[PDB]
Amino acid sequence: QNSLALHKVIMVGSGGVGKSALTLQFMYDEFVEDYEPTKADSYRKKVVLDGEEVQIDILDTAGQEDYAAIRDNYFRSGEGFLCVFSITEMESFAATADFREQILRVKEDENVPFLLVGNKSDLEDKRQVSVEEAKNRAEQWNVNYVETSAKTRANVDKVFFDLMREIRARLE
Numbered sequence: 001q002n003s004l005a006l007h008k009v010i011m012v013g014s015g016g017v018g019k020s021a022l023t024l025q026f027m028y029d030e031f032v033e034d035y036e037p038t039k040a041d042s043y044r045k046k047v048v049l050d051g052e053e054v055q056i057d058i059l060d061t062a063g064q065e066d067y068a069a070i071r072d073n074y075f076r077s078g079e080g081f082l083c084v085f086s087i088t089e090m091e092s093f094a095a096t097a098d099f100r101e102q103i104l105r106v107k108e109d110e111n112v113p114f115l116l117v118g119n120k121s122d123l124e125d126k127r128q129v130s131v132e133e134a135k136n137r138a139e140q141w142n143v144n145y146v147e148t149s150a151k152t153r154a155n156v157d158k159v160f161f162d163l164m165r166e167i168r169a170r171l172e
């Protein structure tokens with residue numbers, strides 16, 4: 001009846017960027033390459049965050065919602081956001097602006113816990129989005145930029161843990 005902190009994370013970003021692959025790497029320690037692109041789902045896991053046992057809830061969104069009101073309701077439920085793009089697809093980086101605005105409209109707080117996540121860092125030779133331009137956007141938004149690979153696990157725990165650290169600090 002002792003209650004753990006429950007950190008509600010939402011994955012956002014355009015299609016194919018790695019939302020599900022990041023989620024499933026974090027949850028199950030597997031790189032999953034064919035996860036149904038239209039499927040949204042939630043995941044929960046106990047994690048030890050800076051020595052404190054907590055629960056993380058991850059909503060892996062898929063952009064499928066029947067109404068804007070439904071999408072906004074999901075976003076309103078979230079406490080922090082991983083805003084993912086693929087470093088190999090410039091258009092997915094451009095699309096992060098829309099997710100940022102959607103989140104800000106619902107959460108009404110420019111300091112909402114939020115990381116800009118450039119995924120597919122193992123595909124450096126296919127990079128379309130420079131580190132510099134992504135860092136500059138993160139600086140404009142006052143968020144951290146982290147590059148990840150769901151394939152190699154690089155920075156996967158970091159993005160989820162660092163987002164939980166922002167939720168913990170900012171929603172106190």
Ligand SMILES: Nc1nc2c(ncn2[C@@H]2O[C@H](COP(=O)(O)OP(=O)(O)O)[C@@H](O)[C@H]2O)c(=O)[nH]1
Pocket residue numbers: 013014015016017018019020021022032033034035037119120121122123148149150151152
């Ligand atoms: N090389 C590489 N491929 C990735 C990575 N993350 C996702 N993928 C691939 O990109 C595709 C889309 O990933 P997915 O997680 O389903 O994208 P979502 O639509 O954002 O959920 C799949 O074929 C994945 O295997 C990554 O970090 N590196």
Ligand SMILES: [Ca+2]
Pocket residue numbers: 019020021035036037038039060061062
């Ligand atoms: Ca997905």
